[PDB]
From a paper:
Despite the success of beta-lactam antibiotics in the clinic, it has recently been shown that an alternate crosslinking mechanism can lead to the bypass of PBP mediated D,D-transpeptidation. The L,D-transpeptidase YcbB (alternately named LdtD), with remarkably few additional accessory factors, is able to undertake this recovery of PG crosslinking function, even in the presence of many clinically used beta-lactam antibiotics. As with D,D-crosslinked PG, the bypass pathway initiates with GTase catalyzed polymerisation of PG; the resultant growing product strand is acted upon by PBP5 which catalyses a carboxypeptidase reaction targeting removal of the terminal D-Ala5 resulting in a donor glycan-tetrapeptide substrate for YcbB. In the last step of the bypass pathway, YcbB catalyses L,D-transpeptidation using this tetrapeptide-containing donor to form a DAP3donor-DAP3acceptor crosslink.
In addition, we report in parallel, the structure of a PBP5-meropenem acyl enzyme complex in order to completely describe the molecular interactions which facilitate meropenem inhibition of the YcbB and PBP5 partners. A 2.2 Å resolution structure of PBP5 acylated with meropenem was also solved with very well ordered density for the covalently bound meropenem. Relative to previously published PBP5 structures, we were able to trace additional residues at the C-terminus of PBP5 (387–397; likely afforded by the differential packing with a neighbouring molecule in our unique crystal lattice). Regardless, the conserved binding mode of the ligands between the PBP5-meropenem structure and the PBP5-imipenem structure (PDB ID 3MZF24) indicates similar modes of enzyme acylation and binding. Meropenem binds PBP5 in a typical PBP fashion using the conserved SXXK, SXN, and KTG active site sequence motifs common to this broad class of activated serine carboxypeptidases. The meropenem is acylated at C7 by the Ser73 side chain hydroxyl of the SXXK motif (the proximal Lys76 of the motif playing the general base role) and stabilised through an extensive hydrogen bond and electrostatic network. The carbonyl oxygen on C7 of meropenem occupies the enzyme oxyanion hole comprised of main chain nitrogens at position 73 and 245, forming strong hydrogen bonds that polarize and stabilize the carbonyl during acylation and formation of oxycarbanion intermediates. The side chain hydroxyl of Ser 139 of the SXN motif resides adjacent to the leaving group nitrogen of meropenem, the likely source for protonation of that moiety to promote acylation. The Asn141 side chain amide of the SXN motif hydrogen bonds with the 1-hydroxyethyl group on C6 of meropenem, while the Thr243 side chain hydroxyl of the KTG motif forms bidentate hydrogen bonds to the carboxylic acid group of meropenem (C3).
Numbering used by the authors: 31 to 397
The structure:
Amino acid sequence: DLNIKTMIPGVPQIDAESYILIDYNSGKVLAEQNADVRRDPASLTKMMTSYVIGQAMKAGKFKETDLVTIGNDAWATGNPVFKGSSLMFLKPGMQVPVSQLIRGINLQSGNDACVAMADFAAGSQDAFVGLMNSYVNALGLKNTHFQTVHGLDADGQYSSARDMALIGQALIRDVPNEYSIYKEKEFTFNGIRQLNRNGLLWDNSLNVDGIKTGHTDKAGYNLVASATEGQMRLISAVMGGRTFKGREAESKKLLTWGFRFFETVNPLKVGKEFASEPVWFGDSDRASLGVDKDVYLTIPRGRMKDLKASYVLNSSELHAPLQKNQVVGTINFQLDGKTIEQRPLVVLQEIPEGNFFGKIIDYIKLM
Ligand SMILES: *C(=O)[C@@H]([C@@H]1N=C(C(=O)O)[C@@H](S[C@@H]2CN[C@@H](C(=O)N(C)C)C2)[C@@H]1C)[C@@H](C)O
């Protein structure tokens, strides 16, 4: 009858030590297990490296076509610390376009390429790690600290499924030109073809434009994945997966589960009037009320027509002056009579005080 419509879906068991599934637009956590346990991120570290780089290029600090000259510290076979790790095989003296180095970072997980771009972007690796951890602070991540540009095992570096899912959200949102690289399945440098090890890119059942893989014998098998269905986008991060086949199978389970049982809705957009309230002492009698940021809600799929919204005002009356985006109350979104999310009710257009004097006196005073 209606137990169907109010059904909570069982969450599938996940053969991973830590995971999280979130909606990209709404931020809603659909499923989680040990999402805040600090773990080693392995090459998921390179998501942040890519984020810092994308911010730099966004700010015009360098271009795709600028040629980086490879220094001694990015010499692949000149630094045995790189042994047994993925590399794009850079040698001192080469001039490699920025567009190729970031593809070594994102697609081949090339640790030498991270060193190349770090010195280029920030002058040194320490400076670049400083940018990384500063963006950790700027994004409000609470279980993430970086000590390398590549994600080779550093004793004091860690992250979490939630923080890595939030880093992936930040990538898609803040630096989309950089994020659009992760869907490329193959990249060739210096006559060596290497594959993007995110096998979900190959899965036709999903529209995975994918993020980053990572694996060390201490981290396990890590993968941050993102897919779309229509205009809904989900993000999954599993850490401590058992095998390469295991981490992708589990991630895919979360993404199809999330898509099948939940949907994302956009019930109100910025600048569209949600409500109207009288105003006192103003040049306008009424205030137009809405949101300063588009509302995205994640609800059970099919239940959109059952979504109801209402609002409360912080004060009994509204007195001018009122500014653009001044918060005067709360919008309540309810499903089945229960409030499922709130977002601030704000003034859509500033409303100054009365001032009804001769327009010319006004000018004259200025003049
Ligand atoms: C990041 O976690 C490390 C790097 N990244 C990956 C990955 O993209 O999944 C692994 S996979 C790579 C595939 N073949 C293995 C190998 O023996 N070599 C040397 C290429 C590893 C890899 C560990 C990064 C820190 O190195």
